[PDB]
């Protein structure tokens, strides 16, 4: 019976909550209060990347830690050289509503998508001197929010409908379909070992999936509103999310619980991007109030503030070698901090 | 200073910048509009007529271009999206105006349309954005009111005490009852609109049919008093 199934689900959820409560004996703050604080951090802008016509929604780093890719609502993708502020490529798109981009780990392809429900893959290294579409992937019903590369032939996408999918590039057909969400999915992050990934949805819940088997492993429910950002700890055993309730949270997979919450009484606006440092000591978060904060990931205090944008901050990223961070906003400017 | 191979990467960047400047010049001369409404409302006929007169399985957005008096206009509508709207409406916070088409011959789904209009009008990201609302399907309203098969007072009790405003100007000249009914519907929408306007954006009402050829002119006029208002604000005059 449906009522019997609902009662069984409620009882099992109560059992899971009881197990989670039992497994907790100490808090992270209590353990970490005997550690010297990092202190004030002074990050200064080094370069400014101008040239975009409209607001910036997405940005991703390259593996070489020197190249950049950014997406704007005017319908263009620009590849930057961060050291010299030169423009290497300028790819015009068929659809002007793009809100995701990604660089392949090899450096040969890029991806983009948005309100057109299509994930487009571009080829950068051809005998001809131009950049051309390699394949357009179709099959999603709603808008696409995120996309990440596993290798040169596999991609992962999250869409407006409650569904994430894993694709093949040689043949455009899907391979696995991840279902179980209730609202729109807006964030996606792969593990360092490229065997698991996490997704944040509008139902105030986060899930972890396995690529090979294709089933949901664990679920996390601590937030009170939509989740807009997600990221992985470098270890691969924790992840941090940002939401519209002006709070950040840190979870752990082995314990399956929540460790700390990063909140302040002055901040009212919600977060839009979350990114870790190379060692995991600092968490960088963008906010709707035109400023980006820097938090200590172990003691939950505001280490520093970055304020250089005249509009809301949309994207944020940290390079592989940890020498710089990049921030894009709705003022159509990209900034490299150090 | 710089090596040879590197003073040939600057030239390429300069060429890219020139192309970007040309694209910016083209971009600044186009006005973008978003078409929004229910499935019952006949926005599809409106867009088909606009495409015919002037100027792919699960695609989520459609684009239509039309030109009037040597100015360009882009119109977008959402085809494959879900029922939720609070997420992708953020991308349309810089459009010139939003066109809201509502059917006027239903008497049963009018409250849903009014609730949708309040959701749109009070959106946080949709402030300082004007709305042009089209009250489509006037012929059906006139025929239904004349026939008298179904009444309107049952759905809206306050219709009995309502009276025709003195500013009503029926251009063709028809029966008073249909005029009273349509002006009552317009007054409901206008009360909703000006409840909390705050002076940052306006609402332009119109009575129209799907086959009418003068829709482009109405859109052009509304976009001109919206651009004029923004230029008034920007150039330190008010």
């Amino acid at each position, epitope marked *: 019976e449906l009522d019997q199934l609902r009662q069984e689900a409620e009882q099992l959820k109560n059992q899971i909550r009881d197990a989670r409560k039992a497994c907790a004996d100490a808090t992270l703050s209590q353990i970490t209060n005997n550690i010297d604080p990092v202190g004030r951090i002074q990050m200064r802008t080094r370069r400014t990347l101008r040239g975009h016509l409209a607001k910036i929604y997405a940005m991703h780093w390259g593996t070489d830690s*020197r*190249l950049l890719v950014s997406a704007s609502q005017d319908g263009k993708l620009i590849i930057w*050289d961060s050291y010299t502020t*030169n423009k*290497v490529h300028a790819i015009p798109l068929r659809s002007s509503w793009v809100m995701t981009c990604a660089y392949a780990p090899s450096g040969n392809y890029v991806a983009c998508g948005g309100l057109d429900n299509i994930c487009s893959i571009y080829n950068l290294k051809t*005998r*001809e*001197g*131009n950049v051309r579409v390699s394949r357009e992937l179709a099959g999603h019903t709603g808008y696409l929010s995120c996309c990440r590369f596993l290798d040169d032939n596999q991609i992962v996408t999250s869409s407006g409908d409650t569904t994430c999918a894993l694709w093949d590039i040689e043949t455009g057909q899907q391979t696995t379909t991840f279902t179980g969400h209730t609202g729109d999915v807006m964030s996606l992050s792969l593990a360092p070992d490229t065997r698991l990934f996490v997704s944040g949805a509008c139902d105030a819940s986060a899930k972890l999936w396995d690529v090979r088997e294709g089933m949901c492993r664990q679920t996390f429910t601590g937030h009170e509103s939509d989740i807009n950002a997600i990221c992985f700890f470098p270890n691969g055993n924790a992840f941090a999310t940002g939401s519209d309730d002006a709070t950040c949270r840190l979870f752990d997979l082995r314990a399956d619980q929540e460790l700390m919450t990063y909140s302040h009484d002055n901040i009212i606006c919600g977060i839009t991007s979350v990114s870790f440092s190379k060692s995991g000591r600092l968490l960088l978060a963008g906010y709707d109030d035109f400023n980006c904060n820097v938090w200590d990931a172990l003691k939950a205090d505001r280490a520093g503030v970055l304020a250089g944008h005249d509009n809301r901050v949309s994207c944020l990223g940290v390079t592989d070698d940890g020498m710089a961070v990049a921030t894009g906003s709705w003022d159509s400017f990209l900034k490299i901090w150090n | 200073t710089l*090596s*040879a*191979e*590197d003073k*040939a*990467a600057v*030239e*390429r960047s300069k*060429m890219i910048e020139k192309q970007l400047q040309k694209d910016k010049q083209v971009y600044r001369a186009t006005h973008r509009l978003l078409l929004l409404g229910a499935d019952n409302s006949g926005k599809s006929t409106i867009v088909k007529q606009m495409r015919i007169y002037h100027v792919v399985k699960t695609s989520g957005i459609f684009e239509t271009k039309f030109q009037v008096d040597k100015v360009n206009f882009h119109m977008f509508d959402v085809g494959a999206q879900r029922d939720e709207r609070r997420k992708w409406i953020q991308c349309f916070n810089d459009v010139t105006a939003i066109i809201f088409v509502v059917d006027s011959s239903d008497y049963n789904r009018l409250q849903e349309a009014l609730n949708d209009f309040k959701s749109i009008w009070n959106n946080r990201w949709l402030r300082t954005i004007s709305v042009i609302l089209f009250l489509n399907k006037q012929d059906l309203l006139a025929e239904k009111v004349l026939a008298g098969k179904s009444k309107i007072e049952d759905y809206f009790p306050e219709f009995a005490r309502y009276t025709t405003p003195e500013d009503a100007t029926p251009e063709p000249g028809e029966d008073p009852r249909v005029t009273r009914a349509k002006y009552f519907i317009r007054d409901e929408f206008l009360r909703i609109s000006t409840a909390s306007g705050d002076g940052r954006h306006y609402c332009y009402p119109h009575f129209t049919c799907s086959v009418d050829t003068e829709n482009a002119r109405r859109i052009f006029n509304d976009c001109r008093d919206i651009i004029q208002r923004m230029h008034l604000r920007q150039y330190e005059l008010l």
Partner: single-chain antibody, 232 residues
Framework: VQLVESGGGLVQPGGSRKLSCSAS????????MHWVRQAPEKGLEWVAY????????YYADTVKGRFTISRDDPKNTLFLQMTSLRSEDTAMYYC??????????????WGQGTTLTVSASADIVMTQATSSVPVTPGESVSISCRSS???????????LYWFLQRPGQSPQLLIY???NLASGVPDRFSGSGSGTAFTLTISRLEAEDVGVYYC?????????FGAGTKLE
């Protein structure tokens, strides 16, 4: 991709000619073009260079006033106008494309070449070793190179290039910037250097590896090539 060129023949001294390079199969407007000439029994020497957008034009010290280079993107072809042809201009001229951005590989493709017969400063000098070196199927070679001035720059790039010319068609690129293998070349080839001394190594010789190996510098114009070594 392909590059077909024509316009060569016997010319009396004091005449003029117009060489053309017809391009088809790639985006011409985004590429730079060079003219390289080779004497009937000697090495290569750089002639001129046009840039994308025709912003920078360079000439060699020998043909600075006589020669003129031009392009026209819509017709997708390249011209080189020569005046006052002396007896030292007898050579086979080539048409080579080059692109320049972070990570690009210039001098990737070479044309067929056209023949031309005429009836009778402080530039970096690169020195090659003895022309010949007798070899056998199955063993390794250690072609060497030398330079007058160090080719390392503040950026960290060493601008040295390697070319192979079979007894047949035009030369093909092997190594660019002293460490990178070009697309289409096997993994046997490898290059190394130390700023003024450079070398090229082939791990296992084959039947198609015979020919003449050349070098280049791209630190500053004009580009000097070197004599070259032959493997028999």
């Amino acid at each position: 991709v392909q590059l077909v060129e024509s316009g060569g023949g016997l010319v009396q001294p004091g005449g003029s000619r117009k060489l053309s390079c017809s391009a088809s199969g790639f985006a011409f407007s985004s590429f730079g073009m060079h003219w390289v000439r080779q004497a009937p029994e000697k090495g290569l020497e750089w002639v001129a260079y046009i840039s994308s957008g025709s912003g920078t034009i360079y000439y060699a010290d020998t043909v600075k006033g006589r020669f003129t280079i031009s392009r026209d993107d819509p017709k997708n072809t390249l011209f080189l106008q020569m005046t006052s042809l002396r007896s030292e201009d007898t050579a086979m001229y080539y048409c080579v494309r080059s692109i320049y951005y972070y990570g690009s590989s210039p001098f990737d493709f070479w044309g067929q070449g056209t023949t031309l017969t005429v009836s009778a400063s402080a530039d970096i000098v690169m020195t090659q070793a003895t022309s010949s070196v007798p070899v056998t199927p199955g063993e390794s070679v250690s072609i060497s190179c030398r330079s007058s001035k160090s080719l390392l720059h503040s950026n960290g790039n060493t601008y040295l290039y390697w070319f192979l010319q079979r007894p047949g068609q035009s030369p093909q690129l092997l190594i660019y910037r002293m460490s990178n293998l070009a697309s289409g070349v096997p993994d046997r080839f490898s290059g190394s250097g130390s700023g003024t001394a450079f070398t090229l190594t082939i791990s296992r010789l084959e039947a198609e590896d015979v020919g003449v190996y050349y070098c280049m510098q791209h630190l500053e114009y004009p580009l000097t090539f070197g004599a070259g070594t032959k493997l028999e």
